[PDB]
PDB file of N, CA, C and O and ligand atoms in Angstrom:
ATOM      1  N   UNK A   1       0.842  -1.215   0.000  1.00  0.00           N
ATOM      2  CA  UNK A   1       0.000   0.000   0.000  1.00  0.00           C
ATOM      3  C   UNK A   1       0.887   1.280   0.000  1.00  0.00           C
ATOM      4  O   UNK A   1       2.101   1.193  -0.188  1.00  0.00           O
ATOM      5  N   UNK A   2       0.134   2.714   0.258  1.00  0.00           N
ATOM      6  CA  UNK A   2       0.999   3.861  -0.447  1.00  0.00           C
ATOM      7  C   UNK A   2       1.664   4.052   1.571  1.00  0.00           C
ATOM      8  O   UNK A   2       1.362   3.477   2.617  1.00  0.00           O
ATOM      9  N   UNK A   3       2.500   5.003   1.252  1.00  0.00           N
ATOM     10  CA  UNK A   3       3.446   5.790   2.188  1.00  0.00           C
ATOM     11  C   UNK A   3       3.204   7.576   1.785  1.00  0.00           C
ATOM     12  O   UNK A   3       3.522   8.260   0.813  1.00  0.00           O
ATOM     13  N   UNK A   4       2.542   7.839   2.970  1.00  0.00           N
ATOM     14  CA  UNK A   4       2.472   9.499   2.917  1.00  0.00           C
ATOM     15  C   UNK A   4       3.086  10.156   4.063  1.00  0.00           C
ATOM     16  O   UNK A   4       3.018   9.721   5.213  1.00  0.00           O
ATOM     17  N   UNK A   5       3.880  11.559   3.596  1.00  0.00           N
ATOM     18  CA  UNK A   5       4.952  11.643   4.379  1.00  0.00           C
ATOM     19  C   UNK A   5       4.358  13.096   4.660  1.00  0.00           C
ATOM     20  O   UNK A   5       3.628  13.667   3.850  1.00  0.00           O
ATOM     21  N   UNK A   6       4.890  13.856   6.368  1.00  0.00           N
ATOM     22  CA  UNK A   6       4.576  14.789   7.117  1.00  0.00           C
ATOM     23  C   UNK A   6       5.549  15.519   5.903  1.00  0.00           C
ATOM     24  O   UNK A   6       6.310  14.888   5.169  1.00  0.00           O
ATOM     25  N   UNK A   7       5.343  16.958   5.877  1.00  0.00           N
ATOM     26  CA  UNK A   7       6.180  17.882   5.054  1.00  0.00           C
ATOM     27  C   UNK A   7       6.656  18.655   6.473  1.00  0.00           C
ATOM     28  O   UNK A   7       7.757  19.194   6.358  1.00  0.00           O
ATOM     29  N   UNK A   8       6.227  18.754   7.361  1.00  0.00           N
ATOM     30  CA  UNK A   8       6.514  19.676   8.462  1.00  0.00           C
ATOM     31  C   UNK A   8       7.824  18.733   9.353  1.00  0.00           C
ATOM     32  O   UNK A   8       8.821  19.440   9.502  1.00  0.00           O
ATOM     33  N   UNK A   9       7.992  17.194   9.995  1.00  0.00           N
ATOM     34  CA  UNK A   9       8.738  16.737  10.651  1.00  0.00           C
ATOM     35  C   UNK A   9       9.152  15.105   9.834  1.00  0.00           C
ATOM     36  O   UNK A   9       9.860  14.221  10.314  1.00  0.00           O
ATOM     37  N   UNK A  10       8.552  15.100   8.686  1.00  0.00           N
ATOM     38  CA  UNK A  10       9.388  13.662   7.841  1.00  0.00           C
ATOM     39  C   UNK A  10       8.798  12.622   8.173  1.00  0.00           C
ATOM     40  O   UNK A  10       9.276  11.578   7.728  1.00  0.00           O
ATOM     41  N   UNK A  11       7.606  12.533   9.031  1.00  0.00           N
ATOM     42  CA  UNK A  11       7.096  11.604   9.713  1.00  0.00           C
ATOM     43  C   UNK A  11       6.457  10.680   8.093  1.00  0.00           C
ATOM     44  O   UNK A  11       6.320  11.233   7.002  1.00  0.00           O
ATOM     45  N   UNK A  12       6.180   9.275   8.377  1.00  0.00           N
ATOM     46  CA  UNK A  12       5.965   8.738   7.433  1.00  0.00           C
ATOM     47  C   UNK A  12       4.672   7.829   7.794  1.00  0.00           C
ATOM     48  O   UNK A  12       4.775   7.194   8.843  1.00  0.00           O
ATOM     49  N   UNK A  13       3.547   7.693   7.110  1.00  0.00           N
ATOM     50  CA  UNK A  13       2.482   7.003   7.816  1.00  0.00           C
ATOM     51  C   UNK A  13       2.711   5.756   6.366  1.00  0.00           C
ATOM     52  O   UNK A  13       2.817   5.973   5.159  1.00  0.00           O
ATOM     53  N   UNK A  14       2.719   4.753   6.972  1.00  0.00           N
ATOM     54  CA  UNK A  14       2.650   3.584   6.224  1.00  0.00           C
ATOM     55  C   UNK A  14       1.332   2.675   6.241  1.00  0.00           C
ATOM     56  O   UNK A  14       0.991   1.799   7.036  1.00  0.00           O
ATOM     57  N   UNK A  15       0.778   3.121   5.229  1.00  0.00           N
ATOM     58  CA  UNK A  15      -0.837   2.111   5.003  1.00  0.00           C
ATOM     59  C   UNK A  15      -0.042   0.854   5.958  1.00  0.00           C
ATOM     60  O   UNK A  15      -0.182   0.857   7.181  1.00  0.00           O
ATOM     61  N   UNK A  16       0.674  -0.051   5.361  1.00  0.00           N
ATOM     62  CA  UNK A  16       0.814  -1.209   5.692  1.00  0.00           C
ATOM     63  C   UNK A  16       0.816  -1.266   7.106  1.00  0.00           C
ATOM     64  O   UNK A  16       0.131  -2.177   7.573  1.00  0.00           O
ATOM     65  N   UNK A  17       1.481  -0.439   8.014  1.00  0.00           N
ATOM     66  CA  UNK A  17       1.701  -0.487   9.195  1.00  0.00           C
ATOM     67  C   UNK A  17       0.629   0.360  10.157  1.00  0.00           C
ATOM     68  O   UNK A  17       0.787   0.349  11.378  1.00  0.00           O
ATOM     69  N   UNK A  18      -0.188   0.905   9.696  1.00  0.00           N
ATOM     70  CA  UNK A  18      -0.614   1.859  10.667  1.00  0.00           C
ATOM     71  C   UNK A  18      -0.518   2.443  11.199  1.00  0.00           C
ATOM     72  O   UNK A  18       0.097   3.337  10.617  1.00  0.00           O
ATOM     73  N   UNK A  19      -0.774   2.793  12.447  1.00  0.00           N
ATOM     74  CA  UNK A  19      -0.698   3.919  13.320  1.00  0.00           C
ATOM     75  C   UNK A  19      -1.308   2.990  14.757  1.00  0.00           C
ATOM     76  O   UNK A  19      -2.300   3.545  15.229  1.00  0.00           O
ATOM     77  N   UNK A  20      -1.000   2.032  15.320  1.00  0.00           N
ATOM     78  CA  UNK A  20      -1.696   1.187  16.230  1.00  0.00           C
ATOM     79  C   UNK A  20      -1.580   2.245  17.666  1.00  0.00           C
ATOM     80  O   UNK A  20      -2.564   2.364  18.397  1.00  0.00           O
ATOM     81  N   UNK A  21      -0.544   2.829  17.903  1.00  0.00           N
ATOM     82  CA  UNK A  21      -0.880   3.695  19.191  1.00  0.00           C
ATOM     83  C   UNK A  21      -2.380   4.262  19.210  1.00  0.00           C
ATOM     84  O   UNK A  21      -3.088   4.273  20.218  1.00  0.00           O
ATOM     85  N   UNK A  22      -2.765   4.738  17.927  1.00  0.00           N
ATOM     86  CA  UNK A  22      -3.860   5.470  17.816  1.00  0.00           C
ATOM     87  C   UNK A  22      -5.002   5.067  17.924  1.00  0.00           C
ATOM     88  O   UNK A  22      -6.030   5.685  18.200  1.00  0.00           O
ATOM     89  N   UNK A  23      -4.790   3.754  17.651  1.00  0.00           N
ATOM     90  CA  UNK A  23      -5.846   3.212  17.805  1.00  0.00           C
ATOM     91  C   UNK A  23      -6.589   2.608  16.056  1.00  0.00           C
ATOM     92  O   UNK A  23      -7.649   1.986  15.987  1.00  0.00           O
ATOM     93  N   UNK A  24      -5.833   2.941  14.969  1.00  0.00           N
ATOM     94  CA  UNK A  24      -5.165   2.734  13.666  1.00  0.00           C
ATOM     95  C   UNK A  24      -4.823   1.021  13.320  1.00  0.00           C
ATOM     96  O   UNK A  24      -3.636   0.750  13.502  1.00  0.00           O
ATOM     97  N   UNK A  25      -5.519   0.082  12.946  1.00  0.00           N
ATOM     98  CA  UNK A  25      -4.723  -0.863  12.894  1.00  0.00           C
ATOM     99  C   UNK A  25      -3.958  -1.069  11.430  1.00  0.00           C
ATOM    100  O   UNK A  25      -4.692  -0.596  10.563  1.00  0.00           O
ATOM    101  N   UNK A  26      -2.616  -1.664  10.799  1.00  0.00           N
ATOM    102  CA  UNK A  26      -2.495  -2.046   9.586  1.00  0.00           C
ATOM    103  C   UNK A  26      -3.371  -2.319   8.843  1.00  0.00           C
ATOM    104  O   UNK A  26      -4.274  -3.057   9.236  1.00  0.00           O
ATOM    105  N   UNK A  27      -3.367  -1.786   7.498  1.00  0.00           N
ATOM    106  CA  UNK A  27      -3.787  -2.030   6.199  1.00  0.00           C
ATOM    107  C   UNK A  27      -4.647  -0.715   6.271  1.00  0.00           C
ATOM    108  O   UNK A  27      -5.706  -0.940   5.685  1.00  0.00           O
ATOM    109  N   UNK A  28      -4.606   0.672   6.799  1.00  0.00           N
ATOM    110  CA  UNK A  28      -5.566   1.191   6.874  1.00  0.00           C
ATOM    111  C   UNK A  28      -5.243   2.435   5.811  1.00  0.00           C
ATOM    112  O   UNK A  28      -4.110   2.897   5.949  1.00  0.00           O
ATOM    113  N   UNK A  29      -6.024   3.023   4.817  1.00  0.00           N
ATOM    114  CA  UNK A  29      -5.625   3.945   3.896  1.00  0.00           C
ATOM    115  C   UNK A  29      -5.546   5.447   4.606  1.00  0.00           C
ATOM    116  O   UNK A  29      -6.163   5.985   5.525  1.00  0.00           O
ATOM    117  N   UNK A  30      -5.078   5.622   4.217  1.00  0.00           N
ATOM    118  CA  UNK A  30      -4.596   7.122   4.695  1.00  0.00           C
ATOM    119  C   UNK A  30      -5.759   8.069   4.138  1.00  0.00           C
ATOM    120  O   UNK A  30      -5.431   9.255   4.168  1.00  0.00           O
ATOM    121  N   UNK A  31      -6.961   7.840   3.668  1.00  0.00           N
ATOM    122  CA  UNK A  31      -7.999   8.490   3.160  1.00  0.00           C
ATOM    123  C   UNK A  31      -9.213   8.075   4.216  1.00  0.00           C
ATOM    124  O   UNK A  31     -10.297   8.658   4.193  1.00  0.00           O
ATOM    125  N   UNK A  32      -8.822   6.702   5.402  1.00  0.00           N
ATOM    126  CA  UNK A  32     -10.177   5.890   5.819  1.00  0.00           C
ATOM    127  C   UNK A  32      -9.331   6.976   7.333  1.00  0.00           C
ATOM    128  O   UNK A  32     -10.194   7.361   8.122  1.00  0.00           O
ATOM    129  N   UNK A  33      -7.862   7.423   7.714  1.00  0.00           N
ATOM    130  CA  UNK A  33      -7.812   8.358   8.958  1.00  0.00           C
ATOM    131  C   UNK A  33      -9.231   8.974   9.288  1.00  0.00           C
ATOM    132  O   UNK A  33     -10.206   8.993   8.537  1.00  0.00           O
ATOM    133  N   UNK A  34      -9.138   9.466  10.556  1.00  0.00           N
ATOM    134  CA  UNK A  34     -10.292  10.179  10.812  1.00  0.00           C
ATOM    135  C   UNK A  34      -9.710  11.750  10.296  1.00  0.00           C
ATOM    136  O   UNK A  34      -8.517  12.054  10.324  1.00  0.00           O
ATOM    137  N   UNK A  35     -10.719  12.584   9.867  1.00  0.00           N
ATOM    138  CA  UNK A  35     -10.537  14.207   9.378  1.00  0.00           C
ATOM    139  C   UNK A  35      -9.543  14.917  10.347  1.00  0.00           C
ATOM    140  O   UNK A  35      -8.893  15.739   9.700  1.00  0.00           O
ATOM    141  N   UNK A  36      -9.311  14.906  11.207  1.00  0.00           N
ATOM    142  CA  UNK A  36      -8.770  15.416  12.359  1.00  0.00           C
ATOM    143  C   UNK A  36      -7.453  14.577  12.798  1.00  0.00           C
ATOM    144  O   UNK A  36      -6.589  15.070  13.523  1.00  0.00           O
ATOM    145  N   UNK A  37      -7.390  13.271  12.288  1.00  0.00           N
ATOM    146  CA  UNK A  37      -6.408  12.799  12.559  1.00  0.00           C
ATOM    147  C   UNK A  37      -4.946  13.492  12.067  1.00  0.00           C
ATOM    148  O   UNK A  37      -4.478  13.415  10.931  1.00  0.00           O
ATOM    149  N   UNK A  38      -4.311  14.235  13.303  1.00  0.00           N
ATOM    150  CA  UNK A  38      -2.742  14.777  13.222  1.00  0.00           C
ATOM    151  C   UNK A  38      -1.642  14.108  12.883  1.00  0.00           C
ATOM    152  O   UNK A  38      -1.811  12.909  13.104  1.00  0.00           O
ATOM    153  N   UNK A  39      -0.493  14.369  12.405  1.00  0.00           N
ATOM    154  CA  UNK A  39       0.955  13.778  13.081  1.00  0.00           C
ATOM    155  C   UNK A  39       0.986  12.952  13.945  1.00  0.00           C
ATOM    156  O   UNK A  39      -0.019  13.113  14.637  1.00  0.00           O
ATOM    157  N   UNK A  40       1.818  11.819  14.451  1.00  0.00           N
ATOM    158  CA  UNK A  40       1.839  11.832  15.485  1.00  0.00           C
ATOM    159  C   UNK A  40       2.933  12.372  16.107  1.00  0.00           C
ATOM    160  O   UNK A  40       3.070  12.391  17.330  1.00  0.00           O
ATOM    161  N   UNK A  41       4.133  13.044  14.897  1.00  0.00           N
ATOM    162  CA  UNK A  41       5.302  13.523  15.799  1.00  0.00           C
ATOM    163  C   UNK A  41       4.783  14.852  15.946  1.00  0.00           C
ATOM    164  O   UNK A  41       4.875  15.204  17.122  1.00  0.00           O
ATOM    165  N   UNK A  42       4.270  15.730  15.202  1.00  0.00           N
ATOM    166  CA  UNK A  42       4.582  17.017  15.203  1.00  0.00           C
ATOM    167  C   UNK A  42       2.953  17.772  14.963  1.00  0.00           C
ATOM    168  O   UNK A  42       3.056  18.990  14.812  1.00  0.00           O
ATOM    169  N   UNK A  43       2.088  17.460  14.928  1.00  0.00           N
ATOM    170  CA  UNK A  43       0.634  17.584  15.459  1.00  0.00           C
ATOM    171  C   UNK A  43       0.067  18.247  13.879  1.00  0.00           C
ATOM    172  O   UNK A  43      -1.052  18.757  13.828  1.00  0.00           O
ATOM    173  N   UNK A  44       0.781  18.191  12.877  1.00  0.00           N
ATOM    174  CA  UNK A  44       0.055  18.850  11.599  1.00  0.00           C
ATOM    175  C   UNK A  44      -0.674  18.263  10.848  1.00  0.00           C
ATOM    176  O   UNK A  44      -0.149  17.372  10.181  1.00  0.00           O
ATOM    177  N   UNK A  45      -1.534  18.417  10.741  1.00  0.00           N
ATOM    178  CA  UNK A  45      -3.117  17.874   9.731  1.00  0.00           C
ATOM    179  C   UNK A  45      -3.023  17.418   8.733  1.00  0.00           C
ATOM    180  O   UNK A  45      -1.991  17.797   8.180  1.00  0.00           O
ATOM    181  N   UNK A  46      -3.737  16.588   8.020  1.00  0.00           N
ATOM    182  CA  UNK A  46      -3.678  15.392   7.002  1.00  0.00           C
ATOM    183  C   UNK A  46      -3.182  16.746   6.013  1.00  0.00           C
ATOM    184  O   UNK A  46      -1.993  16.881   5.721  1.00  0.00           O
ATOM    185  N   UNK A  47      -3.818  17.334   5.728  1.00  0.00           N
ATOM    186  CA  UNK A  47      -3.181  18.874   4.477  1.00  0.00           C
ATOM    187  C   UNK A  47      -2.057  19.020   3.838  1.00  0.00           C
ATOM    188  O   UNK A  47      -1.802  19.276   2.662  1.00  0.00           O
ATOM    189  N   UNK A  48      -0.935  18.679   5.450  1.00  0.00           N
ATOM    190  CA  UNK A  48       0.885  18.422   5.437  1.00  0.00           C
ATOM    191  C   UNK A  48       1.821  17.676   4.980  1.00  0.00           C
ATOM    192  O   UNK A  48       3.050  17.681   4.918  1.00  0.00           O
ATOM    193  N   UNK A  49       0.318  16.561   4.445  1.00  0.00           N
ATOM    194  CA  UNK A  49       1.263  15.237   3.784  1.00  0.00           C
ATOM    195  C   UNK A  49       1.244  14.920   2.666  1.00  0.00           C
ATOM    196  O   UNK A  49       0.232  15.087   1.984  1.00  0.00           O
ATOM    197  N   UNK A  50       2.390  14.364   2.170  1.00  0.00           N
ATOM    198  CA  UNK A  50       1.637  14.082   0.277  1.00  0.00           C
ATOM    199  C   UNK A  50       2.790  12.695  -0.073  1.00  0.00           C
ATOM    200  O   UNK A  50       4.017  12.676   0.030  1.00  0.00           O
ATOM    201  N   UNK A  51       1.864  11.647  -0.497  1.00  0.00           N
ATOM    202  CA  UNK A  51       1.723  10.258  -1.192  1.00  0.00           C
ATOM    203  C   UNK A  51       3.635  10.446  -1.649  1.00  0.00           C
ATOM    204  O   UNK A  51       4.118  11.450  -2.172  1.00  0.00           O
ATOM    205  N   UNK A  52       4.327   9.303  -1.299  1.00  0.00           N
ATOM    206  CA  UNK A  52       5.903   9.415  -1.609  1.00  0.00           C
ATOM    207  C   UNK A  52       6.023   7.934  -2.263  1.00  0.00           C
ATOM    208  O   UNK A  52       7.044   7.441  -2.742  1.00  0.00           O
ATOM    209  N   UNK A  53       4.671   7.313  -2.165  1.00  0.00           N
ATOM    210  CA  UNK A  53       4.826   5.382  -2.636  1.00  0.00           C
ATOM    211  C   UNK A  53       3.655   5.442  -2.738  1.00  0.00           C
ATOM    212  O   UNK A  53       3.011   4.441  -3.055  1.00  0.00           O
TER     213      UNK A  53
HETATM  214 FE1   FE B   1       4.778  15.769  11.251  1.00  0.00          FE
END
């Protein structure tokens, strides 16, 4: 699946891997996040990121 990357701290959200702290499990698209879902390093809004895979 794709890899979308923070423009503000490099952070990298990996469909494949998720975001499980969040409560996020693997395989989850980066379009199914919730609207509000931030960074988790650096708190900036889905807006900040753009598709790198
Ligand atoms: Fe960030």
């Amino acid at each position: 699946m794709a890899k979308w990357r923070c423009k503000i701290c490099g952070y990298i959200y990996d469909e494949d891997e998720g975001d499980p702290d969040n409560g996020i499990s693997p395989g989850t698209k980066f379009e199914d996040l919730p609207d509000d879902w931030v960074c988790p390093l650096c708190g900036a809004p889905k807006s900040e990121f753009e598709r790198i895979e």
